[PDB]
Amino acid sequence: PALTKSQTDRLEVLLNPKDEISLNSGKPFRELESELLSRRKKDLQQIYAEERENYLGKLEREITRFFVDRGFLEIKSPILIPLEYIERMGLSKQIFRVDKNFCLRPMLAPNLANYLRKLDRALPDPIKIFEIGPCYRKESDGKEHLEEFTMLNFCQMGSGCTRENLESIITDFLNHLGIDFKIVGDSCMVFGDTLDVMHGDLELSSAVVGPIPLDREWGIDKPWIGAGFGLERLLKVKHDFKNIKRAARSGSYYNGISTNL
């Protein structure tokens, strides 16, 4: 007997990377579904009994410890921001607008630029800060983009803002998480030349060595470096998820396990 598309989709929802189950092995849908429901119930029961931590929250906490311990100040800035923060940043069709003059932030950079400028009046060189939190863009497009995702951005301004120090921070960070990567040359319209941090064909991060001409519009007038990483992409690599939706804030998956059981 052959599986319908609806049946295959249901089994794919219930399958996890650790399974070694063939959906097209001739076993009827009913037995594959019952087997996978039992395994996923067991998996959630184990999480509930023994760990109880959300993957996104736990990764945020692990990242926070890494950067606080290396001298970076932890920032929590608004998610709902002025629409004016563009074209002050220079996408475009991807912005979720809110009322008339606001939007959901698509990136952390504008608030962090404001903090770098302000903190440089008070703190010793170099200024090192980071933020982790939700960002929003109109794009889902399958297995690597979410509309609601979680960004880490760290940055430094003053001394030590060289390409080699930027690459060394990225290397120490991804070594800490156990993720292999390479660095490639890329570009974008906001920052210009970028380094891209790649895991295979998956972009984990865009990183920048300043100064860039945009600095003047933000009152930034010292060398700087910084990088942005999406946490759901990190989780996708760490847990070998086929689709990034497994990693997202959602009511449909808990730690990559279907909640429809």
Ligand X SMILES: C#Cc1cccc(COC(=O)NCCCC[C@H](N)C(=O)O)c1
Residues that bind K ion (CB under 5 A): 15, 19, 78, 148, 248-249
Of 187 and 260, CB closest to ligand ATP: 187
For 197-204, which contacts have Cβ atoms below 8 Å and span 24 or more sequence positions? Answer: 197/170, 197/227, 197/229, 199/237, 202/144, 202/233, 202/236, 202/237, 203/144, 203/233, 204/174, 204/179, 204/229, 204/230, 204/233, 204/234, 204/237
Asked if 203 interacts with ligand ATP (CB under 6 A), we say: yes
Of 79 and 198, CB closest to its own copies: 79
* The one segment of 29-37, 120-128, 165-173, 223-231 that binds ligand ATP by CB under 6 A: 223-231
Of 67 and 191, CB closest to ligand X: 191
Pick out residues in 79-98 that bind its own copies (CB under 8 A): 79-80, 96-98
Asked if 228 interacts with ligand ATP (CB under 6 A), we say: yes
Of 61 and 216, CB closest to its own copies: 61
- Binding partner of residue 206 among K ion, Mg ion, its own copies, none, CB cut-off 5 to 8 Å per kind: Mg ion
Binding mask 82-101 for ligand X (x = CB under 6 A): -------x------------
227 within 8 A of 154, measured Cβ to Cβ: yes
- Binding partner of residue 136 among ligand ATP, its own copies, Mg ion, none, CB cut-off 5 to 8 Å per kind: its own copies
Retrieve residue 22's tokens.
Answer: 């063939």
Asked if 140 interacts with its own copies (CB under 8 A), we say: no
Pick out residues in 136-155 that bind ligand ATP (CB under 6 A): 137, 139, 144-146, 149, 151
Q: Exactly one of 43, 120, 131, 232 binds ligand ATP (CB under 6 A); which one?
A: 232
165 within 8 A of 225, measured Cβ to Cβ: yes
Q: Is the dihedral of CA 218, 186, 177, 209 positive or negative?
A: negative
Retrieve residue 37's tokens.
Answer: 């429901």
- Binding partner of residue 248 among Mg ion, K ion, ligand X, none, CB cut-off 5 to 8 Å per kind: K ion
Q: Which residues bind ligand ATP (CB under 6 A)?
A: 107, 137, 139, 144-146, 149, 151, 203-206, 228-230, 232-233
